[PDB]
Amino acid sequence: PDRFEGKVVSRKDVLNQSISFTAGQDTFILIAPTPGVAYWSASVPAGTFPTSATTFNPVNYPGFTSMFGTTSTSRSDQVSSFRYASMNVGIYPTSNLMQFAGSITVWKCPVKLSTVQFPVATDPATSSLVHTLVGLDGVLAVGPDNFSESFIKGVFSQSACNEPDFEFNDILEGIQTLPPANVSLGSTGQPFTMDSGAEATSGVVGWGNMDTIVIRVSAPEGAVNSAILKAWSCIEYRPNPNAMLYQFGHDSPPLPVAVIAAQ
Amino acid sequence: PDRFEGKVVSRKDVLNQSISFTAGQDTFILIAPTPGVAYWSASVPAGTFPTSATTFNPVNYPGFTSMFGTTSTSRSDQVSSFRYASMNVGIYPTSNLMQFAGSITVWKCPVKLSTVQFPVATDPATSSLVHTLVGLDGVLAVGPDNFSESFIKGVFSQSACNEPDFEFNDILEGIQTLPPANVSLGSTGQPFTMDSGAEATSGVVGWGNMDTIVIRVSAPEGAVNSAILKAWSCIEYRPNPNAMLYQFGHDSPPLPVAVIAAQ
Amino acid sequence: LSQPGLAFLKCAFAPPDPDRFEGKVVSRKDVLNQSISFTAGQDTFILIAPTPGVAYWSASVPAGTFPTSATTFNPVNYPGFTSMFGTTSTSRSDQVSSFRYASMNVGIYPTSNLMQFAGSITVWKCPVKLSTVQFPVATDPATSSLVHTLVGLDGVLAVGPDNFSESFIKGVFSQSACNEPDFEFNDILEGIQTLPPANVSLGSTGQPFTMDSGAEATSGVVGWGNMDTIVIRVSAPEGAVNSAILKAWSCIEYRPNPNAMLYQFGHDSPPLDEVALQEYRTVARSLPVAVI
Amino acid sequence: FEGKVVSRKDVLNQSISFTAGQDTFILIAPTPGVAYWSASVPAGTFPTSATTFNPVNYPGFTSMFGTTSTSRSDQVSSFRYASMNVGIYPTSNLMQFAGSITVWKCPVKLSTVQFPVATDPATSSLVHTLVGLDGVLAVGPDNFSESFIKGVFSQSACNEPDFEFNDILEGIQTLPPANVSLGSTGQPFTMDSGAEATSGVVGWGNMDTIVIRVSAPEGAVNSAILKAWSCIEYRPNPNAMLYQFGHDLQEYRTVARSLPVAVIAA
Amino acid sequence: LSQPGLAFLKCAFAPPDPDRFEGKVVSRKDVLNQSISFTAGQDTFILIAPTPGVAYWSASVPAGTFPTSATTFNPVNYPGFTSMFGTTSTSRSDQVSSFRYASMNVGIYPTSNLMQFAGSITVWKCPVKLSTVQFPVATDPATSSLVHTLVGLDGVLAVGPDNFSESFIKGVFSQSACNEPDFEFNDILEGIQTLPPANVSLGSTGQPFTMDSGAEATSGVVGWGNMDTIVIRVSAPEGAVNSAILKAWSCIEYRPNPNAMLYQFGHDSPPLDEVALQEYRTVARSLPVAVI
Amino acid sequence: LSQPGLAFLKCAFAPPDPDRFEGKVVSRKDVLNQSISFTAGQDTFILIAPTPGVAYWSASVPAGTFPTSATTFNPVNYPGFTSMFGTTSTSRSDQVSSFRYASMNVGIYPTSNLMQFAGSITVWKCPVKLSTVQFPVATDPATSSLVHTLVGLDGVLAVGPDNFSESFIKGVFSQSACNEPDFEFNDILEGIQTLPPANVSLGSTGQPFTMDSGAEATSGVVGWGNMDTIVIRVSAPEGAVNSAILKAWSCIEYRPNPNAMLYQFGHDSPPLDEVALQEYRTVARSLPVAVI
């Protein structure tokens, strides 16, 4: 809640994902303030942090095509702006009691979007400006303020909102790759590649002023371990008048890091 | 409790069912406001939602033939009307601690009875009207407001009553198949077939103004997993004078989605 | 208990002795009279169903028994049926659209002499409701069907336990009530002159006996009210002369449709009298199954 | 009740012209998805059995209800009205205006009827039945009768004692339905939706119907901007795209009783 | 001027602003509304005849003229015709038997703009009465016959001298009265859908023009009241847009017949208010032919 | 409500009828006037965007429709554009650096006669914001690019539901507000005479229509305010004369730069009036979409 009371649209972003990861891997999980793309993951060969060769893969939230279009110039056709209030992560294992081996680690990372520049020798030679997600460097090493537990219990947690009053950005259209197309990875300062993938299926529409919780699921070999993954997100939307979203609209009213999955 | 105080009949619908499902399946469970038929299930090949080929199978509550007759024109021979107050589902595993693999998911679905029509070219050509259970479409995809946990702990939950004052329907006699006999599945708008089965053994007698809890028991292969299933239902009945039910009669007096099975 | 409140109560409780809704409703004082005789060796049931236009009917079964499939028997009309329900089966919607019942109150006042009467008046309750039933029929191609049916009629096939069973000269007087807790509308049906309808066999619906109507312009059932059907048995054994003057006094709250001149007789429904709810929801069941 | 429901302010905004020399009705009905209901007849006379009828949808009718006879189940389960209201605003100048606007209420409902069916083997059958459109067949005595140049504005209220969630019934194409004779039903006139991909009747609310009579005379250039909106509550299905947007007194009925039939739009 | 007396007067004189008989009479407040348009170059007469069910009719004749034999034109109904007068020509007696008129009061309130209107409203009086006429017809054997006819219709063929003739935008408002000195019954006729009836030629009765009715169940004339027929002329010349909202408000004292539920809306007629006779028999003719 | 507080309110709410920051801010009373005519058979939209220098613009689309890609249409200037924003595209920073909006308030006061007007004024809301969009372009070597784009313009392609739609003679009067809860700065952009910029195709940004500016020294967009863009539609059908006197009155709180003489007209911003926050954050949305 806040001091503003205009026409807003509330939404609950409740994700069901059964997951089954390969043994001998390092399943790494980001839950970032990315609207419509509730989940972010990659796998790296075991024991190690993400590297330069880490090509990243999202999954979308169910029903993403409906309220953000299909095309990279179509990401703001129903909403003009949004906000954030809370996100939740939840991992609950679906595994029996003798094969297991592994650990689950949870800290936060302050990742934010930024603009890095570089000159390009064209004819005539110019310079440009691309988006980049700074802060991502902190993922690559051990954050001390973290959670630490084995695999077999699980973990539940919630994020936080890094602003005194709850101000807001806009939808940033266009973004399909981070760094963008024809721009090299080492030029920006991104150590690992971020990618959305197929244009019509998903994509980054924007960003919010939140913490990003990061999960290091450690998995040794010989331990078949499956779970459900659960993402909640207290997501707001400011709609457009042409959009159908107006018959949901009403006015807005005037714990440590993590715990285990059994509360 | 409510403002009415006529001659009512209380009943507790307490069901014991040990269950043992096939590995590599998707055991799907409905607990719908269907009097005398406490339980509703089907199995689909693994990983998937119900499809068009889903032929559905009930089990009855013990002692159904006694107070609802035997024949499709005999479903209101002891009670003329009823109500609903609460239902409970309970799953408690009977499985040891190393073979298991699986997950349990619980949301609600608002399913209600409706009447779809279609013209039939007879001689002379007419039109008709059949019953259908709309709302069932929401079962076929992931509801966000849900419960999420592995198999090994279990789940207990209770339903809710979707009406401000507790009004009521009637017993709808006749129903043995949903869609009825000689009516095609795709004509109505039912994606998956609902069936009661053998007439004398069971059958749909009516419907109540309740939520319907739905359970997606996920089961990978190689994991023999058995449980008890427990249905409670706070069921009311308004009897008939010819019925024997009158020596039970007295006057009526003037939590989030689910939790795990260990409270 | 405001000024409409006891006026609602005297409409409800004893014409011989609302809620948060404030629309333009019409209140008919249904006041009916029959001087009617019975026949010896002939069990005469009576049914007071919540059916607007038909405040009354008596059913007849041979002595010491209960109705059969062949027990197929008629309505009467409280007068006002040609006026407020038209003449054809697609004409009942012309005046009114839905109805409510405040109460129907029945009383039987005998006029027989003290030297001839024999038998009993036996009164109990039957919660009769209108439902549906489906069944496939052979057609081209084969199809399903769906017609109305009355559930709760099965209860009429035996004497109710909570009853009132005295001599024929003592008379009887009874009250009904709205068994569902708010005064719910019931939209007026049409085309109903046959329950079960034409080309439909008994035993395929579940009704043990038949409500007929006969002629189109003179009788018929237009809908169903949220009221329990009062049932009265007079057995009338062999050797007795059996006549009485019967009463059927009802209060009906109609919802009309802007055609026909009636509306001025109705007024806007009075606002809530929340206290006077408690007088209706206490006294009616405090009164027994029946009285004298 | 307090559960997961959808609030959807549904608005139709359009200008409109009126046909000169003809009597033209507009029915503000509780038929969600469809914005309003209109047809025209010759001036001074009244719609008959030979009078056809038409829908005008809200924007986004196929988006929330699908396109077919097996599509209206998909997104919302049951619904209920709270407050819907219409406003006509004049756009004819001082040099051409003629005719008037007369407003009265009509409490119509949706019921069933039976009829005998003459087949072999014969049965009976039941079709849906608009009960109360007989009440539309005159001018009700509760009148807001006023010449076009001042306009009109009026609200309704729930005609039920409190409220019910009314289900979305599915498969309505015409009222009376297709393959069914009008004379066996008893409706005054046929209420069509056309091709179902364009338009359809998806259910019935706990509201009355507001009928306005505008009969523009001959040579009368009659035109207006029509504003009709509604406040509808939905119970959605969990698979729906509408489901994410969902969320969880006495003075309303004092407004409902003391309201005039309409008010001047100025 | 007792409490029913001014209530009779406000029924009589201006709903916009009895005698020694004390029976159970029913008082309908006939309140009618039409938003109706005219046509340019077309003289529209209006007739307000004392006919229960038909409070209103406008007749149409081409410009600058008067009706012919071919001027054969219809009724409308004030709503309430299917309810209180049945559907068939032998069914009008089902509800009511005779009627009385307290008053009928007409008013025309125009809604046209100030830049287009042209023409006039011309109002006068026509004492129209229902009579008989006999004439022999060739039959086997030759016979006489006897049918109804309306006398006083001859007066409609010209503008009355005592009139009220102003612009179209000014409107008009008028009152009628009972020209015979006590409130006499008039028994309700039936079978009348054609005046003159079928197989009867104009010129053989004396009517210069025809009252038709068309369909049986939707319109008709049921009787005649002891009231003068108010006649209103609108000429509507070439070049003008011509629309108005018209009023026909009447007070009718019915005599019903014990069938149909209506009776409770009526009450026993109040006793004599001999003083308040003088207020009705002075003010009505003190009001002119018409006002604004 | 201190002395600057209602002075802030009368600046905010109706010039026809702050916070914890206390810097040397300059408050221009943006007061603009246009006597402007429309054209028949031609839908004239109006856009009031939060753009300093451009208080107003009307967009034009053929009858009964919505804008296309070819709908490419201009600004005007409230006077003061050459003075406070220079003449070249790299000269807008010369006077001021950032700006705030207290309110902009629009009103349309028609001057047409009562015998000719036809059409409507239709007003709703469009939350338009300035965003970015990236896309790769073929260069040597191949590169990416990044230019501005306006999001929320998609909303203009249809009539808003919460609207105000009356006749053309009735006029309209409206208010805006700051949709984000504190008065945030917006730094002044430069080089913007083309939205989308040169060599950039529509459909590659997402804007369905084009904001142009034309000449460099006479018009341009300098930034964006945290205000919703008020949109007004006048459809202007065939046959009507369509002229009006329009109002655009705005309050702008500038942040200047120590060059140019202006500063003495501005003063230090007054200290907090925490109560008077509640008067601004209650009354503005209590006022509707639009009034007369």
Coordinates of C-alpha atoms in Angstrom, one line a residue, chain A residues 1 24 148 166 199 221:
Chain A
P1 CA 0.0 0.0 0.0
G24 CA 26.4 -34.3 -11.3
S148 CA 22.4 -23.0 3.7
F166 CA 7.5 2.5 -4.1
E199 CA 10.5 -14.2 -29.7
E221 CA 26.3 -37.8 -9.1

